[PDB]
Design a binder for this molecule. Structure first.
Ligand SMILES: [Zn+2]
Ligand SMILES: [Zn+2]
Lengths: 56, 96, 100, 55, 68
RNA sequence: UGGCGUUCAGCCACCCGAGAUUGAGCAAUAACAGGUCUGUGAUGCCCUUAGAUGUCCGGGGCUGCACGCGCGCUACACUGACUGGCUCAGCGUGUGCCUACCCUACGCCGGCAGGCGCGGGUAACCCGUUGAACCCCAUUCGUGAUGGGGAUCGGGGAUUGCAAUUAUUCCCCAUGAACGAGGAAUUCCCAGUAAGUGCGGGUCAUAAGCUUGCGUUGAUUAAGUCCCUGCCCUUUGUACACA
RNA sequence: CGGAAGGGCACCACCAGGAGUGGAGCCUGCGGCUUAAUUUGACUCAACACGGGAAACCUCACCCGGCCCGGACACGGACAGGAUUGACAGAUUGAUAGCUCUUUCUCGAUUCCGUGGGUGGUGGUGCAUGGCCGUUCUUAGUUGGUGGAGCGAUUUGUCUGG
């Protein structure tokens, strides 16, 4: 589900995939994206929205 | 669909305190799964969101059986115009 | 003092590298350590259909799935063991620390 | 009202209780290991779960 | 679409202009006269007035019937 | 190592050696007017659009029956029918996400069905060290549509879900037919193979005559070919032509 | 494509044998019969204990009788002096679904009435299709670069023999 939602959502902003290394108390996910400028929007606003999506 | 006024104001306050909001698509479900403190149905929240989605104030993202909303700049003005709030304060998604 | 660290993994060589690194780190930090107790693996066979409609010849899938289990027995205080487990983690091997 | 006839038939058993979480169809449901997923989407996203056809 | 059997009617609420004026009865002095019975329930007290029927009294939302 | 073969590619017999062929997956080019809108919030077009081809409740139907076939199960017995004694497996499975739904161990109540509280397990621990079926040994029967067969039918007793009759399912008694080794025609396979005979998983409020794996015992024939039914190339007249 | 033949392949071919169907009974499915409905689909290899579709109420795609809007949004009328919505006795109905009737209290701008438009649909079209599956076929066949033949489709390479 975490792959499919970001594949459906980030498809217009140059999405390739995600990489995850599990650590205690820190879920460190790396969106390996082509266009790094398009995925942030405005100082990482869409990233802070996606953190709230994962949190909710 | 008829909606309670205080619950409508609570839903718009929950939308203003964080513009992004999730929902689970389920017909046979009495109350909302996330917002479980205030006893409100999920169908009223879905209709109140698609009423803004149809006239163009929110962006929709669709999962397998889940709905996701993304607040737009017109919704930024609409929420503060409905809640009569000063324009200086911003939601949490505008904060670093 | 009796510590039973269980290591669970799907991959074989990464789990072997992690447990060998833990054994070689225990030899450098000079503590009593047992060998790798190799518990048997588990298998999960799934047989499904290929065609969405019920026409043609009857197909049968063969989906396999494996999982392993290792354990390292230790006789050491927990302050030494936490310093070992904090270093060199990977998302392949899952660690379960039990002190009894 | 209609809400009395809405919650009248119980949904405490079988396919009335559980269904697919992708297509919402009452066909090809696996109750084993808590999947509740149809076989077509299972064959589609079978590699992303971890299953693979080796033998 | 048009069926053979005619449809069953819905209870359209007949609007009454100045229906609140029939509640109180005014006097020449500064007082009031309440004809309808006050509801003694906990959900609604002196605010909601019960219906003035011929044989028993009944309140709106709490569904509480008082017969003589 | 010994024989056949241009003595090349290679092939066969033999000694020694756990084996002188374990099985499966991936599977080139090209195509079907093959299926799937009844898996899909994959989708084009038309229709419906409120008295709705949308949504919800109580039933019925999906099972139904002069007839013909498809996939399966068990008998037609003496190699067998009944009662005890004796002796073995590996796949598995299992304490919850809304959600109630899990494996059962042990002492009792009762002919069975079923019921009462009770301890262990997030699993090489608990069920479990899986006393499974066939098997072998010791009693009863003897050619009788038979003690084989339970097709057919009646009465009572229990569990499951809110709710079972046209029988959800289980238990006890009674009823004892067709069937005397099978016509034309036809399906599968060639060593732990067919076959006899069981046990787990899925379907599961109730759930195996379905399907797949896991076990035990264990044969006859064969080391050749296109005569028969198909598929694949060839030489060539070309009544075979977005073929 | 051969009614002309050869070669090697397969127990969805034979040979020598082994086990089954059809012989008896039963569970189940299809076509017809048929009903208010018996939901629809597929016909030699390549459908018929199938769609994982083993259906007492969901499953239902079908009918019998009754209710809900779950008709977004925009434009003009209604309207807070209440636009709208829920109702117990009791009649009808299947339910104590006010769905209706005898009668009025109640929630309050969410709603109601017409015009445009939108979505909803296991409703139809696989002779429009994506994706996926079966067949040839798990057969040993197939494709490029440089040369030799011409005016070119064509064929040598891509194979006379084992
Ligand atoms: Zn699917
Ligand atoms: Zn009152």
């Amino acid at each position: 589900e975490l792959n499919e939602f970001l594949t459906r959502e980030l498809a217009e902003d140059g999405y390739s995939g995600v990489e995850v290394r599990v650590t205690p108390t820190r879920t460190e996910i790396i969106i390996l994206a082509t266009r790094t400028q398009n995925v942030l929007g405005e100082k990482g606003r869409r990233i802070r929205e996606l953190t709230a999506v994962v949190q909710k | 669909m008829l909606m309670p006024k205080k619950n409508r104001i609570a839903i718009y306050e929950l939308l203003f305190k964080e513009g992004v909001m999730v929902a689970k698509k389920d017909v046979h479900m009495p109350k909302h799964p996330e917002l479980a403190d205030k006893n409100v149905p999920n169908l009223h929240v879905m209709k109140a969101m698609q009423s803004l989605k149809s006239r163009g104030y929110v962006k929709e993202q669709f999962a397998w059986r889940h709905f996701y909303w993304y607040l737009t700049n017109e919704g930024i003005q609409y929420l503060r115009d409905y809640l009569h709030l000063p324009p200086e304060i911003v939601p949490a998604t505008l904060r670093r | 003092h009796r510590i039973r660290i269980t290591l669970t993994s799907r991959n074989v060589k990464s789990l072997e590298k992690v447990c060998a690194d833990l054994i070689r780190g225990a030899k450098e930090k000079n503590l009593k350590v047992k060998g790798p107790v190799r518990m048997p693996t588990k298998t999960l066979r799934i047989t499904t259909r290929k065609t969405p409609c019920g026409e043609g010849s009857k197909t049968w899938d063969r989906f396999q799935m494996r999982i392993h289990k290792r354990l390292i027995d230790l006789h050491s205080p927990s302050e030494i063991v936490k310093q070992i487990t904090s270093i060199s983690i990977e998302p392949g091997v899952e660690v379960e620390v039990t002190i009894a | 009202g209609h809400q009395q006839l809405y919650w009248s038939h119980p949904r405490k058993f079988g396919q009335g209780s559980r269904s697919c979480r992708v297509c919402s169809n009452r066909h090809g449901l696996i109750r084993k290991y808590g999947l509740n997923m149809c076989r077509q989407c299972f064959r589609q996203y079978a590699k992303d779960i971890g299953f693979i056809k080796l033998d | 679409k048009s069926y053979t059997t005619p449809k069953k009617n819905k209870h359209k609420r007949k609007k009454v202009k100045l229906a609140v004026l029939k509640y109180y009865k005014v006097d020449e002095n500064g007082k009031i006269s309440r004809l309808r019975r006050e509801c003694p329930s906990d959900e609604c007290g002196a605010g909601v007035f019960m219906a003035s029927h011929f044989d028993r009294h009944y309140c709106g939302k709490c569904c509480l019937t008082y017969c003589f």
